[PDB]
Amino acid sequence: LNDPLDSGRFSRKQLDKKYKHAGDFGISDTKKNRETLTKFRDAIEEHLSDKDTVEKGTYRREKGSKVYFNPNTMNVVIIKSNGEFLSGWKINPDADNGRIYLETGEL
């Protein structure tokens, strides 16, 4: 019987590995536990479900992945070809990596 956080596009394991990015999604909690991992999971879903969030580019190393970008928060969430959540973070428009993504969709 899987963990309560294992459902839909998520797994507790993946959320734990990527909690380091939770701060980019409005979660300043420094502690990493079930409660904060849940906040992170909810924040990712909120990003994906936002009407202003749209598909934009890919994370090439993860073949067939689709990235979902929000111009307001500047956050991106990477979804594997199978639909599972991979990672996410805030795009910095002032950096060459950020500009390359905005101009070409290559993350």
Binding site: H21, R61, S87, N92, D94, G98
Partner: protein
């Protein structure tokens, strides 16, 4: 605001004073801290972004994806990144 924070982190990592895991987590804290901080050298800014992305590819588990790297690989990349930016 220590504008060299991310670079100092990388140096602590190359000297093995902090682990790959510690580095990969702290780099996110420092990056977030310097995000949007005007009056920041582009050389230092972009160096940090590349360090940030190098860390994103790090995975300690032996079953990591073929495109992911272990701590030894992260060490090689971090050094390569600093040299690239001459930092």
């Amino acid at each position: 605001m220590n504008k060299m924070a991310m670079i100092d982190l990388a140096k602590l990592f190359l000297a093995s004073k902090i682990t790959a895991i510690e580095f990969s987590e702290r780099i996110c804290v420092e990056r977030r801290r310097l995000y949007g901080v005007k009056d920041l050298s582009p050389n230092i800014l972009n160096c940090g972004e590349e360090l940030f992305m190098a860390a994103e590819r790090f995975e300690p588990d032996a079953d990591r994806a073929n495109y992911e790297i272990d701590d030894n690989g992260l060490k090689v990349e971090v050094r390569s990144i600093l040299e690239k930016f001459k930092l």
